[PDB]
Write a protein that binds this DNA or RNA. Sequence first.
RNA 1: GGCGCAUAAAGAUGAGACGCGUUUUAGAGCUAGAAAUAGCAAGUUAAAAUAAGGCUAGUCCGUUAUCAACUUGAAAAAGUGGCACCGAGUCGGUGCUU
DNA 2: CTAATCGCCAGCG
DNA 3: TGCGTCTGGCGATTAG
DNA 4: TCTCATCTTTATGCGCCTACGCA
Length: 1146
Amino acid sequence: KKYSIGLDIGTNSVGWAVITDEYKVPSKKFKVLGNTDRHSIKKNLIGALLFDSGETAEATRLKRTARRRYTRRKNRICYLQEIFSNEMAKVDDSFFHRLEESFLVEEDKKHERHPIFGNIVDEVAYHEKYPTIYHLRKKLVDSTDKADLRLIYLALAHMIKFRGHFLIEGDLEITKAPLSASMIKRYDEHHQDLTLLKALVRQQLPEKYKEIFFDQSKNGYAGYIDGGASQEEFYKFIKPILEKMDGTEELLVKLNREDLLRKQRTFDNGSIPHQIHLGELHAILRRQEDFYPFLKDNREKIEKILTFRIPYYVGPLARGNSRFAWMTRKSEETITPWNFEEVVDKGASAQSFIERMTNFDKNLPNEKVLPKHSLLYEYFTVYNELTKVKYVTEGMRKPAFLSGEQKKAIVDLLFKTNRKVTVKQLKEDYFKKIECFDSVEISGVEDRFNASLGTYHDLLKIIKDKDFLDNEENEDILEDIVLTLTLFEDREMIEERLKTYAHLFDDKVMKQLKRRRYTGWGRLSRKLINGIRDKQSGKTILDFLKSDGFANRNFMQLIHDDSLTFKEDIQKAQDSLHEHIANLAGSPAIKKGILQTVKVVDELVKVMGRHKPENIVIEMARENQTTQKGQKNSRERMKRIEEGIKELGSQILKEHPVENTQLQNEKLYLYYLQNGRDMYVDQELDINRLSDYDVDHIVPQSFLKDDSIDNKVLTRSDKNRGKSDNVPSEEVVKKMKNYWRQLLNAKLITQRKFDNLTKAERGGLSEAGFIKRQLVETRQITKHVAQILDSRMNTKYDENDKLIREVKVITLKSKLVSDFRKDFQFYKVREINNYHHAHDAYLNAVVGTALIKKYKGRDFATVRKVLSMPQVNIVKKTEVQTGGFSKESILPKRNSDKLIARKKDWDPKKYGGFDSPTVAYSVLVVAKVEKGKSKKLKSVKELLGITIMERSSFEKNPIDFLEAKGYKEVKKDLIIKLPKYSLFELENGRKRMLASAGELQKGNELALPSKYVNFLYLASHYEKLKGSPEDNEQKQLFVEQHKHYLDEIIEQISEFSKRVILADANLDKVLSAYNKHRDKPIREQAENIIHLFTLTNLGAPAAFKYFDTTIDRKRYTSTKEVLDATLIHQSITGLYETRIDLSQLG
RNA sequence: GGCGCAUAAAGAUGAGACGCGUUUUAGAGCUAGAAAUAGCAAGUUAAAAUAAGGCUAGUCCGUUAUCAACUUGAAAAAGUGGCACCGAGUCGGUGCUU
DNA sequence: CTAATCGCCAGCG
DNA sequence: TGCGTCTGGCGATTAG
DNA sequence: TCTCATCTTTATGCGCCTACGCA
């Protein structure tokens, strides 16, 4: 009794099948536990397993970073108040208390309602004086009177709370405050344009006044200020309205300059650097320092509060209780911004910032890896390249390798004098000094060398000496200096780390040395290449690479030679399952899929009677391309850039050159791919800044999940942040269409990028689906499952060998199984049911077993029979929902009872709050409740929804929690928890999956016979054949003679919808729509039948479109029947069941 | 199947920062009216919060991953279900033998 | 009169 | 003995 | 949206190792 297992791995499914030698699938009677009458189920050992897609940890990281900046901002304002507190309480000792409780309603305050001055007349006079805050900042900068302390605090707090960016470094008329003057100018232009437009629309269009200046739901002015209208929607609304009137020339000029009715705080203010606010702050401090003494006492503290920023290599200032921290302290105290550099050790933390990320040597797992631009690494690579070259000459019968003196003189002569060398320069420049040069034929290499001592060239250029770099006694010192130039990339600590070596070099070369910068880490450690030795040689690895007798062994032949003592040192140098899976590296989605398929194959081993299988057949997703297209997809970027530059008009490369290694940043590759212009406005682009402009995806990240070069476009700052969540509008198309079509001719961009560029010529969304992230995940997951199944299954070590092959792991390609499917007409359609996962897993097993055994033409009847079985165990994995508490938006107040509060003492009837929480799992309770006016105990049995916010408070103590919810006399033994996708069997074989708390989902499958899916696959793809046509007219007339089949297919849906669907309105509507289309060609009828099949899929209900009639979705919104149905508890494969009957509870 | 070098594409993990947006309050609305209301004036800013919160009280942590039931175990983790044969509308029946 | 049913809506550069 | 790898929540509305 | 750093996988070109069943 020997069997084999076929798997099929995807990103949302795992298909498993168990075959015998004759390609059968056995059936077995399994015992079912519980409290029902039936005690045995016959089931077939074939199935699939479906689950929700595992997601990445990016959004959690973004919200985790966003959580810290709010606490740091509150701490900044707390530091400012702690400075001001004493002199603030000297004059008005309720001011910060009034500022802290301004959010509360008029009766929840404990003080006067006006926050600044308390009384009414002072607040009214203050707001009549300064209409904004920028008037106050300009007045405090310019004037020289002793201002009130509260206005000074308000100006300083507004400067500190919003402070600007930090991209530039160092430092950077009638007034000294240009920003406040610019905002005051914008405010005055707004006022003048408003009164002019008001008078003009009063004159020329008296009927359209209320729609503009009074409606709050439209996109007029009253919708621009109070409603939810942006600037672009308001401009697009108002532009034809004043284009139709007369006397609006300057307003159209301003609207074409985007300076009409503008606000102060808007979206494109992000370009303001913090030096402007710093100048305004220093100005008002130097102005008012004479009156108040304590402003002059600690001006530098207040200026330090604004400019302080935690460096990116230090990290979160923890105290040994975080999970992401690496900071180390020199003391134990509180880290204010004033004593930062007197507490935290910057050097050790900056070293641990880098060292915690890098790899280990994969051959010596305790040593750290060498830098990439190190000297020993470059020597190793260039000798490993040189010690396998072969030359043939005039007196050469059999070819030979080089000599140790020859390889010494070669690296002494031409490698140490050129950046990159060629094969022609090696044949000419060296062999001109050699007599034996006549018929040189050099094999094993290509036209140029792919290894270079470029760090040696930069060091001889800097230090201007060869005697220091030629010696060996300096050697380790050189290693150390490269380490410093890889670790600390901030030129304040490099001087402290490098002061020990300036006693050997000059001062000018020391000043020119610290501007050097390297990056990248290698793949091997220095204890592998110079630490270990051989037994009796006295030679290291690199000593063998300098000279190796006659063999000229390379690195792999060195560390795999059994005649030496390297393999034994590697072998003498070289836990839980879920811990090892957590110890893997990669995306968590393939971690989920790997864990599921390992649990499935382990459980299948456990089912079959503890016997290990013979073969395990998996299908991978790697290919074997051709050399032409493979090298065309491997050609560099300086090919394509120079080709397009040669094709079109070009003057940018006259004074701005570009090599093939300097072009790797995405803010320069797009600058040269777009010929030095902004792609949303015809204007000249700069390279002197090259960072202040922004890269933007054409289709936004909200709708799609791609960030490739076919979607990224480098634009200006205001153009990217002008649009938010849409393809750019038809004005951008009508302006830049000719320029984009000119750039399309040079083949800089593709047709898909230009298709995404003008999606607005069709709509904001035409349709999604096929994304190459799944193509990454499938390849990763099949490589991992092959490695871990070979590691886990075969355990017994052989004595003189590695192990004993008790079970083989075979890996196949999809081309072979698709060829087998296309040969013998075993077709498949993805849009009928979910049986195709189990079916192609079975096909993988059959093809792999037959290809190993035989090389088959007699027995196809058993394959055609098992490809039409009605019973396939489909299991949807029950999960417990975790994530956000509710929707993120904040709804305004209403008198409803489904508004979750935002804080503890903020009642939602007067403050508003969140809404629609996410239900983690449900429970089945039974108790007695007071029935309102009767108020006596009446028996109930219903479903509760435990949200994510209340999960801990439920699991702490359930009885008092749901007692305070409004229940009494409950049975704690009779509480059943129910996660998502819990399975209920109702009457007549109708299955339902519990969606959240009052919603269900369709559970049954559709078993369609093989003749119908064969005729339906041939009915589609009619005009195509994917090749040359022969013997397909018989297939065409076979489709033509079987139209009646299609009518039967409608019957095959209809009675099924009478059994488990119960959605009769959509059913007879769509059969009427089918009866109104009994005359079309067969191709369109099949193309719409495959759209009709989404009525009876598994899972959530959906909406679709038959011909032009759109059928909307019938949702299931009642859970008062699954209280009296059979609850199923399924295993990981669905072979082990536990059936609870809920009708006998009570 | 697995390494080392060069080129290119697709991504992943972590740290530091900006700019908005949303919600309540504050910015005394005037006139004619019993009024349901109508005419008129006005609008650009600020405070606070930005997952409820938690204890380990940090300028820290709180949306990723693990998760069927049953019997043990504090958890970690372990254990729990007979075989052939004829057939097939979501699995049925037959004989062995427990 | 309370439970189906329709239609809208969902933090971002 | 050699050789290839999108779906639930919610208000407004209707039907019973 | 900006700045910084480190990793994986895939395909070509060059050199090289081995497991193991297949011709």
